[PDB]
Design a binder for this molecule. Sequence first.
Ligand SMILES: *[C@@H]1O[C@H](CO)[C@@H](O)[C@H](O)[C@H]1NC(C)=O
Ligand SMILES: *[C@@H]1O[C@H](CO)[C@@H](O)[C@H](O)[C@H]1NC(C)=O
Ligand SMILES: [Ca+2]
Ligand SMILES: [Ca+2]
Ligand SMILES: [Ca+2]
Ligand SMILES: [Ca+2]
Ligand SMILES: [Ca+2]
Ligand SMILES: [Ca+2]
Ligand SMILES: [Ca+2]
Ligand SMILES: [Ca+2]
Lengths: 595, 602
Amino acid sequence: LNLDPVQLTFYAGPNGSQFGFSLDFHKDSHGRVAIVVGAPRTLGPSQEETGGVFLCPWRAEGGQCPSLLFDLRDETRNVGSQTLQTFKARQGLGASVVSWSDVIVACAPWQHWNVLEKTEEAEKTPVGSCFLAQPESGRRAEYSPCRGNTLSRIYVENDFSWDKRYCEAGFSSVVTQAGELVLGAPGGYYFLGLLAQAPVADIFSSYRPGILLWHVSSQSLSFDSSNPEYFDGYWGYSVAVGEFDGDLNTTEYVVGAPTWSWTLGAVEILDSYYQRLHRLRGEQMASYFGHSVAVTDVNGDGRHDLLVGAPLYMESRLAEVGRVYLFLQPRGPHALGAPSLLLTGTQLYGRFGSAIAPLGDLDRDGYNDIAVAAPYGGPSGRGQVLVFLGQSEGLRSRPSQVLDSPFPTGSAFGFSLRGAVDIDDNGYPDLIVGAYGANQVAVYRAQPVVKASVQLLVQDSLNPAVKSCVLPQTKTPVSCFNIQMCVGATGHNIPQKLSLNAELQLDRQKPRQGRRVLLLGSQQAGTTLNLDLGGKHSPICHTTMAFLRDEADFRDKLSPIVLSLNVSLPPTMAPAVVLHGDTHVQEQTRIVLDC
Amino acid sequence: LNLDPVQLTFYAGPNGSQFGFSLDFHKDSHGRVAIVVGAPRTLGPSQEETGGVFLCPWRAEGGQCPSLLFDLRDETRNVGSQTLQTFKARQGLGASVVSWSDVIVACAPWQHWNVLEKTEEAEKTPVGSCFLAQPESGRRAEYSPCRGNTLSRIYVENDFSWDKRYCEAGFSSVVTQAGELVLGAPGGYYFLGLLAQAPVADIFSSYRPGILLWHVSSQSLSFDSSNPEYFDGYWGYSVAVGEFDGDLNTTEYVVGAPTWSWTLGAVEILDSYYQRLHRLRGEQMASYFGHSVAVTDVNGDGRHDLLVGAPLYMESRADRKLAEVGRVYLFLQPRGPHALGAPSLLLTGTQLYGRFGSAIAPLGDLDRDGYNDIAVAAPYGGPSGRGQVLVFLGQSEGLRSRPSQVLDSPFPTGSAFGFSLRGAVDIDDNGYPDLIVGAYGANQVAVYRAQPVVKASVQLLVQDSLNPAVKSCVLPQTKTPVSCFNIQMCVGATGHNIPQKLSLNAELQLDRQKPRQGRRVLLLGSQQAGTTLNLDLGGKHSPICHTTMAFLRDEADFRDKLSPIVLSLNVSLPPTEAGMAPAVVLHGDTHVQEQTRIVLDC
Ligand SMILES: *[C@@H]1O[C@H](CO)[C@@H](O)[C@H](O)[C@H]1NC(C)=O
Ligand SMILES: *[C@@H]1O[C@H](CO)[C@@H](O)[C@H](O)[C@H]1NC(C)=O
Ligand SMILES: [Ca+2]
Ligand SMILES: [Ca+2]
Ligand SMILES: [Ca+2]
Ligand SMILES: [Ca+2]
Ligand SMILES: [Ca+2]
Ligand SMILES: [Ca+2]
Ligand SMILES: [Ca+2]
Ligand SMILES: [Ca+2]
């Protein structure tokens, strides 16, 4: 709602693009936050297809960020017969970035790995990897469960089972609250999908430079499945962490399979033991249900809620426009299955739902908020971010704000969206929009929100011929009533330069020269006053006095008086304020005399 | 707790005018708050003590104030045979000022009134008169419920039954939320005392300038009692309103009778029909149990609680058998309303002849923690006897038994600092209720502003027990290896209206039990086991935690391997005394200890 569109933070990257495929907020232990962006198609050791990650300090003007190296070299180790080796060709370092407690985990899902066992070989297959690093410490603990030495003949022998040659671990990187790192591998089990879990502390403990194999304590890998629906399931395409079970103190992983059950799609909730507590499938085939998955409690009830993206949805306008499915967390026995809000974009081929970013209390509204992105939406397919507030009792169905791509067509503005981290540390979380091949990363800063609570004090009714008030000049006896207005500013971090303007309307329904009551001071049927609330918490109530003419004067006495007070922000750069809540009170006064 | 004692506002009246005897907060139509101060001995137009009320607008420096021009003039109106007279000489206009909505009720209890019929009369007795005003419109009105025209001999003929000649109505004035003015006349019904309650709108709409004896049609008065206990009860010395019977439609009055049942003292809680719901007897005779009464929900359970004051309570010390200090009783209302019984808390003063409990002011939520705080004033307490005010914070069970803050008189001795108290109103509009204390001896009022309360939080994490020499990260500036680990402490500062310059200080003491310079655990850097560093939180919802590398001495080097390794994290405000007064109050947990041990084979 309060995300500043007119001013944005622009971060540049390599001319080879991909700067913005994935990104996250690196929360420093000191309390600072900086944006870490993976560019999975930067230059290699010698102009090679590789990845790469940049670390941008949080700023406003922006610029060329420094680069954080993880691993770019074709290693080769001779374990007896097996001369195993790694290949950086199109590794994609930066396709998944997640940060936690001074550690950054950035993945290269398409990194290759071949083991030469004399004549036979393991084939140069994309096992993928995800490299961990504490930039302050400098320690690098690369993690790659799918790296192995089992030669291809063994795979071919029995049933091509328990394979990890092309798992592509790290297609989606997330980290729990405790620091446990979770990685997706869509290609695991012969292009079926597996997951990896390992403590970052344990990963750093068990890692040894040079050697290209380990087990790293009790790292938890997903179970291989022979179910036909899982074939080419593409599990671990997108992952997130949130609390969903009946017990606390445990972190669940939500994983998306956009091709589950013959491109139908699914999303699953897993514990650390991978018990599959809940699984919700898609509705439209080839709609890519699960491309991006987000976890946040926008309802404000505390219990986390689920958002699932289907950018390839074909709306029954059969127009290819994505859709975000919302799932509030209920208190039923087997609840959470039925979706509640189905948000759908407008621009054709917009891919509405490629990036769902939790935002938390974006506008100090008391409920969490979200930002969905359609990378090819908008007027001319540029791509647009749709901010949806909590609003309680569900989610804001309408876009509280629409952020337009300032990038040319095809930049896919809005592929990776992250929020839920107050970058301004002002109770107002910000948003970051990165896009694959964008070459630029945009950051939206939220602005203070002012809720208004408005009340009126007007006499309910009176005799038009009371004749108690006295006109100054003419000295005529007239009836009159007490008109007062009190508007107060609620919310957090309200700016002290507030200049709210209140406009009063007496007999609003009646037109001009059809009006009945009329102000003494200004001789007008309505005025605006600077009812500024800046610099104080108490409401301002400056009254007025409008006279009511004699019976014989007018004839609109049969019409009851309408007293509508409407408060609006001043019209006079960036407003830095968003009026919300009650802003128009129309308490009424009727005319009562005999009939 | 957070009431600033350094920067005070001083509002002055005329010399010897008793400016500050009673006071209340008047809210202007625009929401601007002003103070109504009674000065019950201000010089009248004819150089005589009559009374007066000042309307002090809120400022920073303070000073002189304008006064509400009432009608200070004796009145004489002959209604045919009789001759009604009102004498406004030493009437005490300002002895009880209470502001409700846009009206101010300033009562002169000692205004005299006579009815001259031929030779006879009704005796020139003090009936009292409250003066209602609307300073934004000039609408003046008067209310004298106890005025009568019955000749003196009639009461003698009927045993002084329903004798309302000595009411001094306005001795204690309150206004309910529904706009009903309730006056306690301690001297009504021949000093038994009564309550006179009438709607303010009816008071304004039944007053005609010139008529002295009229009758408000909707007013209600108490019942004269033949029970010997009530005699000379002064029933109406102090009066307050609150909810005590269940139904929120009915409003109940709490009325003090400080000399009920032969100076024993009592407080009666009774509904609008003056049916006694409950009676709270005194504890010690001549203690004036009922001198001050306040109603507020200190414990926050949603039910109003009662605060009684006995300024002349003589406590039973071990050394002194009976010493006059004063005592405030706290009664907590439970469910099942007609069960409020034994007192829940018994606060007692310290200074002799300090009159602890002469004023009980509900402060609202001064600390902003969901519980109601009060102020009890001893006008002659304090080591020098010049006057003290004690702030008591509310909690789940009763309220704090010790004064969170103590305010001392800035005025010379005998100023009666604390006689009049009034609070629970944000005067400067900074989100925190303020307090106004009236020292009529010095003819001044002190305004205390509540500075913001910074609620702190501390979380010092030490990962686990460690081995003496793990031979990890080397000792600083040496290739010599030692055992190293991380110390991380997150400190947060949450509060309302906190300034942008807040910067706490974290004292990190490494095994404070051991003497410094040779502690078992030092830092991997400067090696100083005690490091106090500033951590700024000037508008940061995210606690900031600068991790530190810490070194552990050799197993042979440190010989006490059995003593617990206890790290100390202390949070303190910076030395703001160098500049102006401390702008914040760092209430809350600011000091924690975290203990670990020495592990082996790790
Ligand atoms: C989580 O809370 C505490 C702290 O870790 C722990 O002792 C407790 O067993 C946990 N609760 C669960 C697992 O339900
Ligand atoms: C209080 O008064 C309201 C008037 O609207 C009434 O509806 C309600 O029943 C009353 N409650 C009682 C008498 O307990
Ligand atoms: Ca859980
Ligand atoms: Ca929920
Ligand atoms: Ca919000
Ligand atoms: Ca922000
Ligand atoms: Ca009641
Ligand atoms: Ca209570
Ligand atoms: Ca409190
Ligand atoms: Ca204040």
